[PDB]
């Protein structure tokens, strides 16, 4: 879905949306995402990157390029090998071979729950495919095609959903608005969002170039 996201971003950016801007008319409540990353912890110098999704499921992308996901029921597990092969297990019944990884996941889970703010908390299955950080942002690519970009300095966030051709923007006051990209082309948007969308295009290009 990355190339579709790139085309959607090309189209909106080429329309020069910030140049009468009628940004409010580009909002679409029907396009609100189901999943996004609400918390994350970068322990990649030792273990990997842990994260919580907005449904309270947690996942780790380990340094050996495997993934373990704990469902929000707190017992059901999905393990994804490097090849991409999925296995389904539980904490109550797992092979000894995954003990190390499960214990690491539980520690990440407990820490995030206790210590980090839940992004998009005021709003009512995929795993982390890859991620990277720049000086400005962390970029999270989910297995359902969604791409999330969290900007460090001002705490603003984009969630890009190529299947809906939509983008959710969480601003500095933590207001959460979801826009149809084609409506941003039609009605325009503020310079702030337009700038973030230009950055997003460059980030999606990075994902595509490092496949």
């Amino acid at each position: 879905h990355l190339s579709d996201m790139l085309q959607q971003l090309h189209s909106v950016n080429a329309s020069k949306p910030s140049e009468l801007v009628r940004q409010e008319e580009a909002e679409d409540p029907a396009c609100i995402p189901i999943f996004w990353v609400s918390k994350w912890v970068d322990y990649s110098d030792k273990y990997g990157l842990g994260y919580q999704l907005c449904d309270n499921s947690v996942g780790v992308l380990f340094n050996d390029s495997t993934r373990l996901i704990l469902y929000n029921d707190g017992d059901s597990l999905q393990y994804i090998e490097r090849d991409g092969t999925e296995s389904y297990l539980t904490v109550s019944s797992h092979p000894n071979s995954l003990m190390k990884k499960i214990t690491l996941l539980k520690y990440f889970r407990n820490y995030m729950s206790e210590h980090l703010l839940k992004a998009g908390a005021n709003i009512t299955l995929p795993y982390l495919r890859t991620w990277f950080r720049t000086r400005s942002a962390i970029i999270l690519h989910l297995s359902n095609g969604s791409v999330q970009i969290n900007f460090f300095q001002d705490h603003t966030k984009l969630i890009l959903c190529p299947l809906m051709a939509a983008v959710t923007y969480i601003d500095e006051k933590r207001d959460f608005r979801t826009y149809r990209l084609s409506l941003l082309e039609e009605y325009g948007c503020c310079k702030e969002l337009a700038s973030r969308l230009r950055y997003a295009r460059t980030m999606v290009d990075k994902l595509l170039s490092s496949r």
């Binding site: 994350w40 210590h115 980090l116 703010l117 950080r133 969290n150």
Partner: peptide, 5 residues
């Protein structure tokens, strides 16, 4: 590093 505290 961590997400927002």
């Amino acid at each position: 590093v961590l997400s927002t505290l």
